[PDB]
Amino acid sequence: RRICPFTGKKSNKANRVSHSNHKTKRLQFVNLQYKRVWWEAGKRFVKLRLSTKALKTIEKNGLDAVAKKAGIDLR
Amino acid sequence: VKKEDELKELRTKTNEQLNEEILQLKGELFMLRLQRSARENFKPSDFGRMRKRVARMLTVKREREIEQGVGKRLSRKLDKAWKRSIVVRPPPSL
Amino acid sequence: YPRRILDVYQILQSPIITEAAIKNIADENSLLFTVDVRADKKMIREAISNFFGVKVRKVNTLIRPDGTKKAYIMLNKEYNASELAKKIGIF
RNA sequence: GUAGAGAAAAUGCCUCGAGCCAAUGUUCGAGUACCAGGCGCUACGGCGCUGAAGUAACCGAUGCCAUACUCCCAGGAAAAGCUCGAACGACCUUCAACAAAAGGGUACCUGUACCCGAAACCGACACAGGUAGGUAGGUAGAGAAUACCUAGGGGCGCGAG
RNA sequence: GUAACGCAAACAUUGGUGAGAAUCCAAUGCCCCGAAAACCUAAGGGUUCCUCCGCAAGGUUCGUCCACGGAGGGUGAGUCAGGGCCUAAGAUCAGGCCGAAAGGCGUAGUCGAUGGACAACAGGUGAAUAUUCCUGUACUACCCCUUGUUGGUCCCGAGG
RNA sequence: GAGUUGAAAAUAAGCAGAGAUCCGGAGAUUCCCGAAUAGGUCAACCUUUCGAACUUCUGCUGAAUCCAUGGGCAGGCAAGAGACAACCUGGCGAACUGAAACAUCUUAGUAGCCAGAGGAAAAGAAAGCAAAAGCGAUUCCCGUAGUAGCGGCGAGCGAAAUGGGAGCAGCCUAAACCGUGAAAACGGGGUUGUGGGAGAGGCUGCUAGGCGAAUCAGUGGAGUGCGGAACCCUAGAUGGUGAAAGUCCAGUAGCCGAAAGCAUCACUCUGACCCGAGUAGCAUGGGGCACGUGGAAUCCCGUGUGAAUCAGCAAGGACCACCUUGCAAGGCUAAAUACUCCUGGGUGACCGAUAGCGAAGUAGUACCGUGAGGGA
């Protein structure tokens, strides 16, 4: 599923247009990733699927601050 | 006869009702069939009696246990356990 | 835990009354009955033995095509089915 | 039987009335029947009594031996039942679990009718059609072809000129 | 009131039944099939099976007859077949992965015979069932008791 | 309150004034399949050890690592699951067609599928309208108006404010501060616009019922109609009855009635500090607002950047200045509004068996189709 569990971001609809306006539909996906994060208390790896902006939010406000807004934790 | 039935069997107490119920649904149900009992000796009201008799019996066990508690889940379970342990035997008049 | 399916005290509907059954009473020393469709051999033999106080060498059962189970109930050489069935109104 | 982490498989020891593997065959099963034919029924169907001989020779299968033998390459299912067995890990354990012996005693569910090389399935039809498998008699013949027949089954549901 | 009446194996007679018979039953001939047009099964039908009655409709004619209509009956299993055992192709799939939703992949398992594993034969009987009922003679699986051994049982490692 | 034991109606035996049959409210039972749920399955069966399977609740435990998570065993009336005509919310999303062809555009965010929930749902209490005059959350009708506009400026698409109505209702929460370490996790203090904060000084109705006026004859199957003579009316609504009745019947106007259950009323400021942040804005790619990127505002989105805090921030159709208006990035909320598988009451210049629902007869039946499905 193309959903970041933290930001709640989805893919977006887009009628991506030619020079002549002969449209289609396609999805502008989210810039997700499988990546390890570093928990403060535990001090372990956490193998998660996040957005790029999720990283920015985690580096802003420490994991547990962010992770309360998506109920599930302790893997 | 009808209005009497509560005054009859609300006095008889549960373990009395077992053998009462069974004896009722035993003979005067089963024995009255067989050849439809002597061919001119049905008295077909007897089927009307016993069917309505046992149904009045089973209410008293049930309607008593509501006051205690139970609530139809346990009731069905103990109906299986009770029903599991029976053993048919000759009815009265045989 | 006894019965495949629990059914009843009841089970036995009625004995079959016809010309084949009467002859089978004399020949095989055996009764003939209509029972529950969900009636077992074991169940029938426990019922009829425990009812009349008679022994049962074997029971053999079939389902006539409407869906009502009829059972031949055979009796030991000791117990006499002619006189037994006489006192249940078949003779 | 033994070594070596090793109870099975595997590296070396010995020992085998030197023999095994089978289908048929001898007996009981079976002094019983079954039985060709005779002696009486009484009207549209079988049924009571009696009851002889019951062996040999040759031919012989696509059947069995045989999951046998030879040859070939394209190299020919799984899993439980079964038999060992030592572990470790659990349970059930001294009104008990596994082995053997005659005699006892005990015995779940469903299918079973009838058609099924078809007037009953499949083809709209009581349709010259289709439909998996089994059993395979005699004479002639290489033969499951053919021709004529047995057992068994039929004369094709408009007829007359 | 024409074409047709579904193969060119084939019928004939005597008697019977009955309101009525080329067509229904019986006998006698004759002829046809016989690696079938014979007798058993699997699938499928789904009561067509047997008995007594009826003949409006159905049956390419008739019809006293019927796979037709009405009424009543008929299918008996420890050993036959399946399931209560086993697995293949395939199916579904806990946790797991992936996907707007619906869902897709996929392991552990679980289903799934067309295969493995398992114990019965003859004679007899009867309108309609018979390895099922009867008679004889069998076999498989359990509970007794006589000897016993101290553990069994599952998992589990092998043979097969 | 008088005869009953369903429909077709026959028999047999029963139950009925000590009050059945019936009618209403509340309870009890409810085989098997089906969310199906002990396990399996070819729905209505088979196997069992007889069990709500699975998940969050709640009691213990104890993996690979301390804690923890997975997992295992328990108790559990045990919340959830499925179904449901239309209406409705959200997700995906056509094409034929129109443009006399056709790709922008139109069909349309329509049909369809998918998910969700209620009696309505959604919206909703101003970072809003509007213009120097003012208005005060939504939603629906009349209107403005086919006007302003947009548009291969083609086909077409098409607003809003002012104005008249229907109906009206407004709330709560986080931090700055406080206490029991500290963003261990809990209670109090406050939440507002032409700036605000804390801090320091039983009542009625419904679900059964009840009482309820007044006509007689002649008329040749039968009279309610015809000629005759009456009467009632707070009853001349209806349905029946051998032929059409205010007075034959059931009724109606009018009054009476509930054990039980459901609905309804019952003074200062350091201008300290606070003002919802990866947010707004910005670059770039889009969607949608009547508005096709156009001078393109407003609203929402992928990518990358990335503020400020009422000496503030946003809007007023690029944009800057000055005015005016409001306070975004947390939530909740009745009504007016939409609809009919359906219940009760009423009505019809509606149908009358080729009509009216497909269906006036045991019709989604017979029948056809492998199946979806069609269908007398």
Curated annotation (Swiss-Prot), chain A:
Signal peptide: none annotated. One of its GO terms (biological process) is translation. One of its GO terms (molecular function) is structural constituent of ribosome. GO terms for cellular component: chloroplast; ribonucleoprotein complex; ribosome. Its main location: plastid. Keywords: Chloroplast, Plastid, Ribonucleoprotein, Ribosomal protein, Transit peptide. It is found in: Plastid, Chloroplast. Belongs to the bacterial ribosomal protein bL28 family. Component of the chloroplast large ribosomal subunit (LSU). Mature 70S chloroplast ribosomes of higher plants consist of a small (30S) and a large (50S) subunit. The 30S small subunit contains 1 molecule of ribosomal RNA (16S rRNA) and 24 different proteins. The 50S large subunit contains 3 rRNA molecules (23S, 5S and 4.5S rRNA) and 33 different proteins. Component of the chloroplast ribosome (chloro-ribosome), a dedicated translation machinery responsible for the synthesis of chloroplast genome-encoded proteins, including proteins of the transcription and translation machinery and components of the photosynthetic apparatus. This is Large ribosomal subunit protein bL28c. It comes from Spinacia oleracea (Spinach). The chain holds residues 72 to 146 of 148 of the full protein.
Swiss-Prot record, chain B:
Its main location: plastid. It is found in: Plastid, Chloroplast. GO terms for cellular component: chloroplast; ribonucleoprotein complex; ribosome. One of its GO terms (biological process) is translation. Keywords: Chloroplast, Plastid, Ribonucleoprotein, Ribosomal protein, Transit peptide. One of its GO terms (molecular function) is structural constituent of ribosome. The keyword Cytoplasm does not apply. Component of the chloroplast large ribosomal subunit (LSU). Mature 70S chloroplast ribosomes of higher plants consist of a small (30S) and a large (50S) subunit. The 30S small subunit contains 1 molecule of ribosomal RNA (16S rRNA) and 24 different proteins. The 50S large subunit contains 3 rRNA molecules (23S, 5S and 4.5S rRNA) and 33 different proteins. Component of the chloroplast ribosome (chloro-ribosome), a dedicated translation machinery responsible for the synthesis of chloroplast genome-encoded proteins, including proteins of the transcription and translation machinery and components of the photosynthetic apparatus. Belongs to the universal ribosomal protein uL29 family. This is Large ribosomal subunit protein uL29c. It comes from Spinacia oleracea (Spinach). The chain holds residues 59 to 152 of 168 of the full protein.
Swiss-Prot record, chain C:
One of its GO terms (molecular function) is rRNA binding. Keywords: Chloroplast, Plastid, Ribonucleoprotein, Ribosomal protein, RNA-binding, rRNA-binding, Transit peptide. One of its GO terms (biological process) is translation. One of its GO terms (cellular component) is chloroplast. The keyword rRNA processing does not apply. Two forms of the protein exist; they have the same N-terminal sequence and approximately the same molecular weight. The gene is RPL23. Component of the chloroplast large ribosomal subunit (LSU). Mature 70S chloroplast ribosomes of higher plants consist of a small (30S) and a large (50S) subunit. The 30S small subunit contains 1 molecule of ribosomal RNA (16S rRNA) and 24 different proteins. The 50S large subunit contains 3 rRNA molecules (23S, 5S and 4.5S rRNA) and 33 different proteins. The chain holds residues 104 to 194 of 198 of the full protein. This is Large ribosomal subunit protein uL23c. It is found in: Plastid, Chloroplast. Component of the chloroplast ribosome (chloro-ribosome), a dedicated translation machinery responsible for the synthesis of chloroplast genome-encoded proteins, including proteins of the transcription and translation machinery and components of the photosynthetic apparatus. The keyword Transport does not apply. Belongs to the universal ribosomal protein uL23 family. Disulfide bonds: none annotated.
